[PDB]
């Protein structure tokens, strides 16, 4: 046996030049794709913004064209999904996770257009979903598209070009190269056996796409939270506690995301019409909320900075938390195209802040700043619901640049994952592949 | 398909027993690491204040600098040849082996040997880093508690071993993430999936990092300040720098190995000619650590100085050569202690010089050499160890200049890319492969 190792060891880190070059193209495409998608959502959120101007006097009439603008845009997207690409509804990440096990198809000729224009409308109407959904799936697809179109062959190149698309796709959505890389190797990568996913390949794609995102979205953070205070050792136990809280709520939130998913299915029955109408309903409800209480609706990024600066009351926080648990589920469990990742960043931020707010009053002797707990909590729901702690932590790091909070973050996030396990819940992106797969089976 | 649905639903489950044990492993490796750190200081200090007792007689002080290092070096080379041959050199390849179940983890032996062993090579001011000692000591500490708690399984053997190695790197650089990524990019049996639980490793890394902090709080090993940003029209420069690291990467591996051979003959294998050749290089270091500290030592001290563009282009090219020389001599020779840190220093220095030139060729880019120093710091690590992800995050964690993330990723990747196409190998892996071919032949 030993003699094969010595032949393997000496062959370690070799990635066929063909593959590498292709990842580069994959990356560049996904980047541009992602940037295009980003401009899209803006433009629409804008038209919407300036349509409430045309009707700025009649309060009842404006509440209307807010609802109908979101409703119409939402429907356009739910439809686009049910008609031409069922698999492109919801997140799409579990779908890409499947493709790595070779257990789901990558219908790129279908999904690319469907997901792109599909989300372009659910996000545009101001529903509570993130870009990661669309970009990661669009990412992998863009991945396979160039696999096919260059008739590249192999087990390596199929899983490797697919992964790097997914990474460059997450990278491009958060301006987070490392988060994109760690994402593959912690949530994606067929987690029960080793695969031929070349890390170096992924890297390249993530780079190329990050550079694309930068050619266009330079000079302004998604989240600018400033540089917060440090965290003294005698303060650490507090983050463990916060974690334990995220770790029990983690599962319960997964329960709901799935439950609510079921309970929503009945509404339409499966019927493309009752669906597209129920979509346009939630859709519209969002555009209504995005006007008369923006913190309850929308991606959630806007309220992150505000909440980390302790600029919300404890009331406004508990409100925003509930309103958002509600609009998040409604928007995602319902099957609209778009991620649940970002709205989870917002959820955890808000929760964490409230924790800090209390921590601050119970311990003046710790000289706390609630903001540090908001930052500890930002990737914490992601920790307990997705079981991607390493990924969340580095995502938040890349996005908020408060490295001093690394211990507090790791502790909240780990402590989150620990309790998500011992209270018995599952990787939400994985329990969703498992539903999907049990249904594709228990109908044959 | 039906097994997947049963596997997927079982994903992320790590036996509570293991987790609790990682915690202990971590705490131990932490304390271990901190103790080791105080040790090296204390000795570097005695040495410092021995050149005081003899502060007048220049020829006599050059002497007790050489002899103090020489004596301390020998004590350690010996301690290795006599009781634990495997604890010489880095020890990481040794731990890498144990993950394939292809090398023994003689903890009852190596712990004391590596600890006191390095305590002397580092103390005497040789050019080697704490990672060597801590990572190996780490895994050992790992197995020690596996055995002593008769824990069983394939999971718990590779898990508890990895988390020790991680907590061990973590503790050496105050780098939790770098420690975690380190396992899953350089360690983890890279040809098949293993039962190394990430969540397990994490916990140990944490516990050990908190130990390192209970004692080494307030004071960053490398305080480089917050450097300037890097404009897109500036990125191609870091690609070029990487291509340079990527061709030098292999050549440095050639030497580390070659020089390793060429040094073997010196002592033949003979524990006496070895311990004497050790004490020789040892002493040469303490001599250099006085009359030119930048050529000797761990190298951390000169990082800040070089990133602030406080060396001349001359002093840089000198320090680079003198250091390639002392680094090889110190590591290829078999002394206990890592090559990681001296690679950080090597890359920093190289990068700076690159920046210095970049600055004069392009006043229109408003460059700061410092950014290229930071791009280069993990770059040799990229091309020689093929751990780019790990280097990047190590430098990130140590220098807190996240704005340089693109420049860094680009230099590092571009480094790894050329290390491949110019045909070189993961140095920590070519070393397991030598070791293994000799235990076979």
């Amino acid at each position, epitope marked *: 046996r030993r003699r094969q190792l010595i032949r393997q060891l000496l062959e370690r880190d070799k990635t066929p030049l063909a593959i590498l070059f292709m990842a580069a193209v994959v990356g560049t495409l996904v980047g541009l794709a992602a940037v295009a998608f980003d401009k899209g959502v803006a433009w629409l959120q804008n038209q919407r913004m300036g349509a409430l101007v045309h009707t700025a006097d009649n309060y009842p009439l404006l509440l209307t064209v807010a609802f109908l603008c979101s409703a119409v845009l939402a429907m356009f997207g739910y439809f686009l999904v049910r008609k031409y690409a069922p698999e492109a509804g919801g997140s799409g990440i579990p779908e890409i996770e499947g493709a790595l096990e070779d257990q789901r198809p990558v219908r790129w000729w279908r999904v690319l257009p469907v997901k792109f224009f599909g989300g372009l409308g659910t996000l545009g109407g101001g529903m509570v979903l993130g870009r990661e959904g669309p970009t990661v799936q669009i990412g992998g697809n863009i991945g396979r598209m160039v696999l096919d179109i260059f008739r590249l062959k192999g087990d390596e190149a199929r899983h490797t070009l697919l992964a790097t698309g997914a990474a460059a796709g997450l990278a491009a959505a958060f301006n987070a190269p490392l988060a994109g890389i760690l994402f593959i190797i912690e949530v994606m990568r067929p987690q029960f056996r080793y695969t031929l996913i070349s890390i170096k390949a992924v890297f390249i794609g993530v780079i190329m796409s990050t550079i694309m995102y930068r050619i266009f979205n*330079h*000079e302004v953070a998604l989240i600018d939270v400033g540089k917060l205070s440090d965290a003294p050792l005698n303060t650490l136990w507090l983050y463990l506690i916060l974690g334990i809280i995220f770790g029990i709520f983690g599962p319960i939130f997964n329960k709901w995301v799935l439950g609510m998913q079921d309970l929503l299915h009945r509404v339409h029955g499966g019927n493309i019409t009752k669906w597209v109408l129920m979509g346009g309903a939630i859709g519209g409800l969002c555009g209504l909320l995005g006007f008369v209480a923006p913190a309850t609706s929308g991606g959630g990024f806007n309220l992150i900075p505000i909440a980390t600066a302790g600029n919300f009351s404890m009331g406004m926080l508990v409100f925003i938390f509930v309103a958002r648990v509600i609009t998040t589920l409604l928007c995602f469990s319902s099957g609209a195209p778009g991620g649940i990742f970002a709205p989870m960043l917002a959820l955890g931020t808000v929760l964490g802040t409230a924790f800090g707010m209390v921590a601050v009053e119970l311990f003046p002797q710790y000289h706390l700043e609630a903001g540090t707990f908001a930052i500890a909590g930002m990737g914490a729901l992601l920790a307990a619901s997705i079981r991607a702690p390493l990924t969340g932590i580095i995502l938040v790091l890349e996005m908020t640049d408060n490295y001093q909070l690394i211990l507090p973050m790791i502790i909240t996030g780990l402590g989150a994952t620990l309790l998500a396990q011992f209270t018995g819940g599952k990787p939400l992106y994985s329990a969703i592949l498992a539903r999907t797969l049990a249904k594709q089976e228990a109908e044959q | 398909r039906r097994q997947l649905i049963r596997q997927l639903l079982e994903r992320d489950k790590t036996p509570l027993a293991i987790l609790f044990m990682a915690a202990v492993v971590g705490t131990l490796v932490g304390l271990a690491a901190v103790a080791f750190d105080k040790g090296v200081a204390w000795l570097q200090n005695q040495r410092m204040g021995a050149l005081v007792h003899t502060a007048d007689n220049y020829p006599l002080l050059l002497t007790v600098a050489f002899l103090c290092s020489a004596v301390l070096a020998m004590f350690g080379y010996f301690l290795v040849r006599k009781y634990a041959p495997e604890a010489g050199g880095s020890g990481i390849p040794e731990i890498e082996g144990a993950l394939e179940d292809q090398r023994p983890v003689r903890w009852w032996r190596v712990l004391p040997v590596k600890f006191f062993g390095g305590l002397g090579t580092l103390g005497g001011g040789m050019v080697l880093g704490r990672e060597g000692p801590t990572v190996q000591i780490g895994g050992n500490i790992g197995r020690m508690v596996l055995d002593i708690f008769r824990l069983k399984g394939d999971e718990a053997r590779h898990t508890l071993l990895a988390t020790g190695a991680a907590a061990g790197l973590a503790a050496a650089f105050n780098a939790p993430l770098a420690g975690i990524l380190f396992i899953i990019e350089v360690m983890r049996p890279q040809f098949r999936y293993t039962l190394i639980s990430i969540k397990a490793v994490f916990i140990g890394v944490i516990m050990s990092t908190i130990m390192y902090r209970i004692f080494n709080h307030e004071v960053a090993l490398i305080d480089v300040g917050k450097l*300037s940003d890097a*404009p*897109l*029209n*500036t990125l191609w420069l870091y690609l070029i720098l990487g291509i340079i690291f990527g061709i030098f990467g292999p050549i440095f591996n050639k030497w580390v190995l070659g020089m390793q051979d060429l040094l073997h003959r010196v002592h033949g294998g003979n524990i006496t000619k070895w311990v004497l050749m050790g004490g020789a290089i040892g002493g040469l270091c303490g001599l250099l650590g006085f009359v030119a500290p930048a050529t000797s030592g761990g190298g951390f001290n000169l990082i800040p100085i070089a990133t602030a563009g406080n060396f001349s282009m001359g002093m840089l090219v000198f320090i680079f050569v003198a250091r390639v020389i002392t680094t090889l001599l110190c590591f290829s020779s078999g002394a206990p202690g890592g090559i990681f840190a001296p690679m950080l220093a090597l890359g920093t220095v190289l990068g700076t010089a690159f920046g210095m030139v970049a600055v004069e060729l392009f006043p*229109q880019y*408003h460059l700061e050499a410092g950014t290229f120093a930071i791009a280069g710091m993990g770059a040799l690590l990229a091309a020689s160890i093929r751990a780019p992800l790990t280097g990047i995050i190590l430098v990130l964690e140590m220098t807190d200049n996240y704005q340089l993330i693109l420049p860094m990723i680009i230099t590092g990747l571009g480094a790894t890319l050329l290390a491949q196409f110019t045909g070189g190998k993961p140095l920590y892996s070519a070393i397991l492969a030598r070791t293994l071919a000799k235990q076979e032949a």
Partner: antibody
Amino acid sequence: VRLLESGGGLVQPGGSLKLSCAASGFDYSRYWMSWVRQAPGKGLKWIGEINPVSSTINYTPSLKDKFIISRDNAKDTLYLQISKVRSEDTALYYCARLYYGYGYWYFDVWGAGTTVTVSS
Amino acid sequence: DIVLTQSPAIMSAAPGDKVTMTCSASSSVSYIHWYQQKSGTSPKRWIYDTSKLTSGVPVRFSGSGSGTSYSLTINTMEAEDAATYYCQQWSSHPQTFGGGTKLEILR
């Protein structure tokens, strides 16, 4: 964010003066600072720039110690010293914060000016 | 040092016109900038990297060019656009400014 330059006025030919630029409303380290001047009725001319750690200081092609650009981040203030002032030095002196987009640098934000008049 | 020469030294136009000034450079430049300078006032960064508008600059403004020829147009000029437009390169060192198109209004 404000740049408020000062110390312009009457100087005798062959003399010398120290214009100062007071910076406020932004982290005055972090930024390269610069001086540009407008001769009366005429166009813009770059005098020089200084990086935040005063370790780079470029000038326009001109004579050895003609201009001396310096900064003092302690005081959030840029300085310009002009020597052996001749009449061509009579102008409006602008203080500018430097920045970039793709990376070809530009004069981001400008002060109001002080005027230097060289006259017997 | 690159010499930038701006086409019309002075020019006139009725609001509503499409107005267009020119920056020509002696050697090659890339991503040049523009500062409008309204009267008795300090220059304001207007267009940059050849065609990005600074925040605030009304959208009637646009930039373009490459090589040795750049322009700073203004689809449907307005009366308040009356300024002297200076162009500037820093793709080569040292930076250099153009001479100046003076925009003169016709009521």
